[PDB]
Write a protein that holds these residues in place. Structure first.
Motif, PDB file in Angstrom:
ATOM      1  N   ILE A   1      13.222 -57.884  51.521  1.00  0.00           N
ATOM      2  CA  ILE A   1      13.982 -56.848  50.823  1.00  0.00           C
ATOM      3  C   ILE A   1      14.808 -57.476  49.711  1.00  0.00           C
ATOM      4  N   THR A   2      14.834 -56.831  48.551  1.00  0.00           N
ATOM      5  CA  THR A   2      15.730 -57.236  47.478  1.00  0.00           C
ATOM      6  C   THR A   2      17.039 -56.472  47.620  1.00  0.00           C
ATOM      7  OG1 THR A   2      13.910 -57.729  45.964  1.00  0.00           O
ATOM      8  N   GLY A   3      18.152 -57.191  47.515  1.00  0.00           N
ATOM      9  CA  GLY A   3      19.463 -56.580  47.551  1.00  0.00           C
ATOM     10  C   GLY A   3      20.096 -56.631  46.178  1.00  0.00           C
ATOM     11  N   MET A   4      21.067 -55.756  45.922  1.00  0.00           N
ATOM     12  CA  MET A   4      21.742 -55.754  44.639  1.00  0.00           C
ATOM     13  C   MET A   4      23.228 -55.521  44.844  1.00  0.00           C
ATOM     14  SD  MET A   4      20.127 -52.185  43.397  1.00  0.00           S
ATOM     15  CE  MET A   4      18.580 -52.807  44.048  1.00  0.00           C
ATOM     16  N   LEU A   5      24.019 -56.194  44.026  1.00  0.00           N
ATOM     17  CA  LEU A   5      25.455 -55.965  43.938  1.00  0.00           C
ATOM     18  C   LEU A   5      25.710 -55.473  42.519  1.00  0.00           C
ATOM     19  CD1 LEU A   5      28.178 -56.429  45.635  1.00  0.00           C
ATOM     20  CD2 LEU A   5      28.496 -58.415  44.124  1.00  0.00           C
ATOM     21  N   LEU A   6      26.081 -54.199  42.384  1.00  0.00           N
ATOM     22  CA  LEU A   6      26.238 -53.609  41.054  1.00  0.00           C
ATOM     23  C   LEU A   6      27.339 -54.298  40.260  1.00  0.00           C
ATOM     24  CD1 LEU A   6      26.034 -49.806  41.911  1.00  0.00           C
ATOM     25  CD2 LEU A   6      24.118 -51.492  41.596  1.00  0.00           C
ATOM     26  N   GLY A   7      27.043 -54.585  38.991  1.00  0.00           N
ATOM     27  CA  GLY A   7      28.014 -55.236  38.143  1.00  0.00           C
ATOM     28  C   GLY A   7      29.143 -54.300  37.753  1.00  0.00           C
ATOM     29  N   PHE A   8      30.316 -54.892  37.504  1.00  0.00           N
ATOM     30  CA  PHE A   8      31.459 -54.107  37.045  1.00  0.00           C
ATOM     31  C   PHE A   8      31.146 -53.398  35.737  1.00  0.00           C
ATOM     32  CE2 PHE A   8      34.980 -56.725  39.300  1.00  0.00           C
ATOM     33  CZ  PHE A   8      34.521 -56.240  40.503  1.00  0.00           C
ATOM     34  N   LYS A   9      30.604 -54.137  34.754  1.00  0.00           N
ATOM     35  CA  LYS A   9      30.292 -53.526  33.464  1.00  0.00           C
ATOM     36  C   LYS A   9      29.153 -52.520  33.600  1.00  0.00           C
ATOM     37  CE  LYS A   9      29.671 -54.343  28.596  1.00  0.00           C
ATOM     38  NZ  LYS A   9      29.264 -55.151  27.401  1.00  0.00           N
ATOM     39  N   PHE A  10      28.143 -52.858  34.402  1.00  0.00           N
ATOM     40  CA  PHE A  10      27.102 -51.892  34.749  1.00  0.00           C
ATOM     41  C   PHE A  10      27.700 -50.578  35.245  1.00  0.00           C
ATOM     42  CE2 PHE A  10      24.294 -49.948  37.920  1.00  0.00           C
ATOM     43  CZ  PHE A  10      23.158 -49.697  37.137  1.00  0.00           C
ATOM     44  N   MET A  11      28.597 -50.645  36.229  1.00  0.00           N
ATOM     45  CA  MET A  11      29.176 -49.395  36.725  1.00  0.00           C
ATOM     46  C   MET A  11      30.058 -48.708  35.688  1.00  0.00           C
ATOM     47  SD  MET A  11      30.038 -50.319  40.747  1.00  0.00           S
ATOM     48  CE  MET A  11      31.240 -51.530  40.230  1.00  0.00           C
ATOM     49  N   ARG A  12      30.892 -49.469  34.969  1.00  0.00           N
ATOM     50  CA  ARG A  12      31.806 -48.857  34.008  1.00  0.00           C
ATOM     51  C   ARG A  12      31.056 -48.089  32.918  1.00  0.00           C
ATOM     52  NH1 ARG A  12      33.471 -52.408  30.005  1.00  0.00           N
ATOM     53  NH2 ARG A  12      33.361 -53.961  31.694  1.00  0.00           N
ATOM     54  N   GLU A  13      29.943 -48.634  32.416  1.00  0.00           N
ATOM     55  CA  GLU A  13      29.221 -48.031  31.290  1.00  0.00           C
ATOM     56  C   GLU A  13      28.044 -47.143  31.689  1.00  0.00           C
ATOM     57  OE1 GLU A  13      28.191 -50.798  28.217  1.00  0.00           O
ATOM     58  OE2 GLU A  13      30.321 -51.130  27.766  1.00  0.00           O
TER      59      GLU A  13
ATOM     60  N   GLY B   1      23.582 -53.376  48.386  1.00  0.00           N
ATOM     61  CA  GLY B   1      22.668 -52.339  48.823  1.00  0.00           C
ATOM     62  C   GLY B   1      21.230 -52.683  48.468  1.00  0.00           C
ATOM     63  N   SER B   2      20.311 -51.821  48.924  1.00  0.00           N
ATOM     64  CA  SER B   2      18.873 -52.002  48.739  1.00  0.00           C
ATOM     65  C   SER B   2      18.189 -50.649  48.593  1.00  0.00           C
ATOM     66  CB  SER B   2      18.228 -52.757  49.918  1.00  0.00           C
ATOM     67  OG  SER B   2      16.865 -53.074  49.640  1.00  0.00           O
ATOM     68  N   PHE B   3      17.102 -50.626  47.809  1.00  0.00           N
ATOM     69  CA  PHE B   3      16.215 -49.466  47.714  1.00  0.00           C
ATOM     70  C   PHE B   3      15.099 -49.467  48.759  1.00  0.00           C
ATOM     71  CE2 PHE B   3      17.399 -49.059  43.035  1.00  0.00           C
ATOM     72  CZ  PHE B   3      18.211 -47.958  43.280  1.00  0.00           C
ATOM     73  N   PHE B   4      14.923 -50.556  49.506  1.00  0.00           N
ATOM     74  CA  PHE B   4      13.885 -50.653  50.537  1.00  0.00           C
ATOM     75  C   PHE B   4      12.509 -50.266  49.990  1.00  0.00           C
ATOM     76  CE2 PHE B   4      17.929 -50.004  52.699  1.00  0.00           C
ATOM     77  CZ  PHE B   4      17.928 -51.008  53.636  1.00  0.00           C
ATOM     78  N   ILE B   5      12.196 -50.744  48.778  1.00  0.00           N
ATOM     79  CA  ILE B   5      11.037 -50.222  48.052  1.00  0.00           C
ATOM     80  C   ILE B   5       9.759 -50.423  48.860  1.00  0.00           C
ATOM     81  N   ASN B   6       9.627 -51.583  49.508  1.00  0.00           N
ATOM     82  CA  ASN B   6       8.407 -51.872  50.256  1.00  0.00           C
ATOM     83  C   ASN B   6       8.260 -50.923  51.440  1.00  0.00           C
ATOM     84  OD1 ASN B   6       7.327 -54.129  48.758  1.00  0.00           O
ATOM     85  ND2 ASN B   6       9.089 -55.302  49.526  1.00  0.00           N
ATOM     86  N   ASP B   7       9.364 -50.649  52.140  1.00  0.00           N
ATOM     87  CA  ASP B   7       9.350 -49.692  53.242  1.00  0.00           C
ATOM     88  C   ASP B   7       8.889 -48.321  52.762  1.00  0.00           C
ATOM     89  OD1 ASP B   7      10.484 -47.518  54.945  1.00  0.00           O
ATOM     90  OD2 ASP B   7      11.302 -49.178  56.131  1.00  0.00           O
ATOM     91  N   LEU B   8       9.531 -47.814  51.706  1.00  0.00           N
ATOM     92  CA  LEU B   8       9.187 -46.505  51.164  1.00  0.00           C
ATOM     93  C   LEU B   8       7.716 -46.442  50.767  1.00  0.00           C
ATOM     94  CD1 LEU B   8      12.440 -45.764  49.071  1.00  0.00           C
ATOM     95  CD2 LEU B   8      11.819 -45.192  51.444  1.00  0.00           C
ATOM     96  N   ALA B   9       7.174 -47.553  50.254  1.00  0.00           N
ATOM     97  CA  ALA B   9       5.811 -47.564  49.738  1.00  0.00           C
ATOM     98  C   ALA B   9       4.767 -47.516  50.849  1.00  0.00           C
ATOM     99  CB  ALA B   9       5.594 -48.808  48.879  1.00  0.00           C
ATOM    100  N   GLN B  10       5.069 -48.087  52.014  1.00  0.00           N
ATOM    101  CA  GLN B  10       4.097 -48.188  53.094  1.00  0.00           C
ATOM    102  C   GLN B  10       4.254 -47.113  54.157  1.00  0.00           C
ATOM    103  N   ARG B  11       5.409 -46.442  54.228  1.00  0.00           N
ATOM    104  CA  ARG B  11       5.653 -45.463  55.276  1.00  0.00           C
ATOM    105  C   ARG B  11       4.850 -44.190  55.006  1.00  0.00           C
ATOM    106  NH1 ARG B  11      10.666 -45.148  56.620  1.00  0.00           N
ATOM    107  NH2 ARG B  11      10.528 -43.033  57.482  1.00  0.00           N
ATOM    108  N   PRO B  12       4.710 -43.309  56.002  1.00  0.00           N
ATOM    109  CA  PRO B  12       4.000 -42.043  55.765  1.00  0.00           C
ATOM    110  C   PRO B  12       4.673 -41.184  54.703  1.00  0.00           C
ATOM    111  CG  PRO B  12       4.965 -42.148  57.988  1.00  0.00           C
ATOM    112  CD  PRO B  12       4.929 -43.543  57.438  1.00  0.00           C
TER     113      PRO B  12
END
Ligand code: NA
Length: 248
Positions: A134-146, A167-178
Motif C-alpha cells: 500500500i502507498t501512504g500519503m501525508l498531505l503537504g501544508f501548501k497542498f492543503m492550503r492551496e 492515509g491511503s487510497f488502497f488502490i490495489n484492494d479497490l482494483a481486485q475486490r468485487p
C-alpha cells in the motif's frame, strides 16, 4: 423533516472536519453521527496496521450493523466507504449524499473513479508518499492550503495542519475486490453535491462522475472549495435539509 445523518470523512482526515456542520444540523432537530475511520482522527490504529479497505472502513461498517434508516454523507474518498456500507446495508439507508466525493458505480471495478482521478494529474505539491508492507500519503501544508482549503477560514486550515494524518487510497484492494452490486449500492437513492471552485477534484471531474452514474439529485455549491462543510457550512446545511425533506 428530521433525519439521522452519518458523516464520513475522506483519506487523511477525521470526524473533526464536520465540527461546524454537526451542531448546525443538530440545531434543526437532526441526529448526527460523525465517525473516525480506522487510523483516522483520534483512532488509535496507525495506517501501517490497516491492511485492506474493509479494515479501513470497519468503524462505519460496525456502526451500520449496530443501528437500532440514515442519510450517509461521504466526503472526498469517503464516497468509497459509504458505497461499501450501502452495498452491505441498503435497507438502512434513506439516501447517500456524495459531497465533492469519489462516487463509484456498479459497471466497473471500485478503483475506476480513483483511477480517473489520477487521470486528472493532480498536483500534490509538498505531499509526502511512502510504502508499507500500500502507498501512504501525508498531505503537504501548501497542498492543503492551496488545493483543498483555499476558500476556508484560516483557522480551519490550522486544524488541518494540526490534525491530518497519514492515509491511503488502497488502490490495489479497490482494483481486485468485487464490483459493488446492483442489489445493494445500486438500489439506494444518491445525491451528488459538487463545488465549483474545487482545486483538487476539478468541477469537470465531479460532473464526469455525475454523468457516469446519474444520481437522483444534483446540487451545486457556488464558491465551494474541496471542503464545503468548512467553507460553505450554512449553504450545505440548507441542501442537506432539502435532502432530508425529500427522502424521509
Ligand atoms: Na473523533
Amino acid at each position: 423533516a428530521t433525519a439521522h445523518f452519518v458523516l464520513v470523512h475522506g483519506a487523511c482526515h477525521g470526524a473533526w472536519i464536520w465540527y461546524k456542520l454537526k451542531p448546525l444540523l443538530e440545531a434543526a432537530g437532526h441526529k448526527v453521527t460523525a465517525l473516525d475511520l480506522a487510523a483516522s482522527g483520534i483512532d488509535p490504529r496507525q495506517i501501517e496496521q490497516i491492511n485492506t479497505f474493509d479494515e479501513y472502513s470497519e468503524p462505519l461498517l460496525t456502526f451500520m450493523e449496530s443501528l437500532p434508516k440514515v442519510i450517509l454523507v461521504g466526503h472526498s474518498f469517503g464516497g468509497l466507504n459509504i458505497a461499501l456500507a450501502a452495498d452491505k446495508y441498503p435497507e438502512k439507508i434513506s439516501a447517500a449524499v456524495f459531497l465533492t466525493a469519489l462516487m463509484p458505480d456498479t459497471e466497473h471495478s471500485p478503483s475506476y473513479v480513483v483511477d480517473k482521478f489520477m487521470e486528472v494529474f493532480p498536483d500534490w505539491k509538498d505531499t509526502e508518499f511512502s510504502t508499507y508492507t500500500i502507498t501512504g500519503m501525508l498531505l503537504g501544508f501548501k497542498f492543503m492550503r492551496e488545493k483543498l482549503y483555499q476558500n476556508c477560514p484560516i483557522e480551519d486550515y490550522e486544524l488541518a495542519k494540526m490534525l491530518t494524518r497519514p492515509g491511503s487510497f488502497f488502490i490495489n484492494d479497490l482494483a481486485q475486490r468485487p464490483k459493488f452490486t446492483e442489489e445493494g449500492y445500486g438500489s439506494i437513492k444518491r445525491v451528488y453535491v459538487w463545488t465549483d471552485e474545487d482545486k483538487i477534484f476539478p468541477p469537470e471531474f465531479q460532473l464526469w462522475q455525475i454523468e457516469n452514474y446519474k444520481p437522483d439529485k444534483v446540487y451545486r455549491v457556488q464558491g465551494g472549495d474541496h471542503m464545503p462543510q468548512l467553507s460553505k457550512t450554512n449553504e450545505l446545511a440548507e441542501i442537506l435539509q432539502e435532502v432530508a425533506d425529500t427522502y424521509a
